[model samples]
Target: IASYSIPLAETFPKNKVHWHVQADRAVLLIHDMQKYFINFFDHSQAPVPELLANISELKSLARQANIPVVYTAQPPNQDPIERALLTDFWGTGLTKDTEIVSELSPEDGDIQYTKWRYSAFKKTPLLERMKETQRDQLIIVGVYAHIGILSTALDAFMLDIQPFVVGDAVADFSLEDHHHTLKYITERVGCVTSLEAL
Candidate 1:
């Protein structure tokens, strides 16, 4: 990891810390938008259709821009060491969390990080990888906005990495949860931006 950061002292007071994504400095993080979790929402709904469209566009743009795309998945049969207290909450889990949806599948150069917790940075080399790639910001997308997506955004902020949460590119069980997550991210950690603005 190379030396890179934005001090919270300077980042906290300002609105989204005046955050803006730079293609040269950004990484695309497609968080746990896996099969089992995606079933909770209808793909034909408001945000779902838009989210997919936005991510597809971003994936293509990221490739054309040479921006690194990072993805994470919490597969079934996770080692107990990694699972930790996960079972206590999910009750042993469904075997399906492991299955990634084909629509968001990674391309040849994409990076895969094992997601064992709500935070994608949780034990993975996310920070180090970002450092290696010189990515100081993350364009975040995917499901369960209030849970994994929110956690990952805040974690990125804590590390002084700006998180540009693609508002329409992330989803949740309800519209309320989706909206709340975007508000919280904008208020606390990073900017809640849409694909068009990016």
Candidate 2:
């Protein structure tokens, strides 16, 4: 019985950032949607299932369209020094439950890397890979909508890379948090969209 999304329609038009998604120039970021964090939300609820389905559908479309897909995961046995102050907020790194969900698991030829901070770009070569693929736009799908995902979107914008946050594909501690993140990013960081629209 936690907070639920404040309804996207209620607060529509978060921003007017000239929303656009070019398949050839876009990359997909499947962020930290690990089971360990997902458990924080009621995954059996209506919107939760919707989130899962949306992300699966996104992965399918990206694959068929030859769009690059990248994922982020934290170290399972992360050391204290490696975790640093993050442990104070998120607890002792990733635990046994920190497995990547089965439906969104990485496949062959897919880019997978360890996320060392809230922004996947912090210690990851996500930028280099983006340059290698020659993709400037990023479509994001994953968890803690207010934290890692939102931070990534903002950082992407600063690097002159366009970030697209899919509304239905990201989950968080509460729907309100999810709703707020989607709204915040769309207003300042990136374009907030849905799987159907993409």
Candidate 3:
């Protein structure tokens, strides 16, 4: 895969036209890497192991560089609205194991955000935390490419934050959704590249 590239003419109206290149003080945003999303989907739906391996490598790289690593996990909620949404979309009960996967768990110092919505920024302090840390660039990788990852990317651009999407590090409920999300983001919104490109 090729490295990420930005267009001279900013496709996102809310974003700045020029791209900001800065690797230092960057943060890795891992969205919904939890078992609630991963375990429910099959390989044909989305390659889970491949995505996990790529994210693992990126996590190692971030650790070595002393970059902040942030992970978002879908927390169980008893509220009817939340429960109904989960059942309607994900199909099911609220179990503890539905949280983040144990194997790809967050470390002690790693930042963890428990979100109850599709967009991580909806009610979370994610943007504020990144701002407080003075992180200008963000590398996002997570589950459901069309939902969390895509929404987060658009919001990041609007916030004037540089975002590099780790293509293979994200999976969707279906291959069609995955590729469609990727194509839309790459062709119309922002940079979409794989971990190998980094």
lDDT per residue as tens, model 3, 9-102: 2222232234543557688888888776666665333276577777889898888888888888766655666555657766655566555676
Which pairs of residues clash in candidate 2, taking residues 3 or more apart in a chain or in different chains?
none
On residues 1-198, what C-alpha lDDT tens digit does candidate 2 reach at each position? Answer: 353542454454555688689888998899987887777766676556777788888998999998888888877878889889998997787667666788888888688888889887888899988888788999998877888999899889998899998887777767777777887887787798877778
TM-score per model over all chains: 0.86, 0.91, 0.80
**Which segments of model 3 are wrong by more than 4 Å?**
1-21, 43-46, 81-93
Candidate 1: C-alpha lDDT? 0.77
Candidate 3 residue-pair clash tally: 0
lDDT for position 20 in model 2 = 84
Q: Is candidate 1 or candidate 3 better by lDDT?
A: 1
Most accurate candidate by TM-score: 2
**Deviation in Å, model 2, residue 92 alpha carbon:** 1.6
Of the two candidates 1 and 2, the one with more favorable TM-score, higher being better, is 2
Candidate 2 runs further than 4 Å off: 1-11
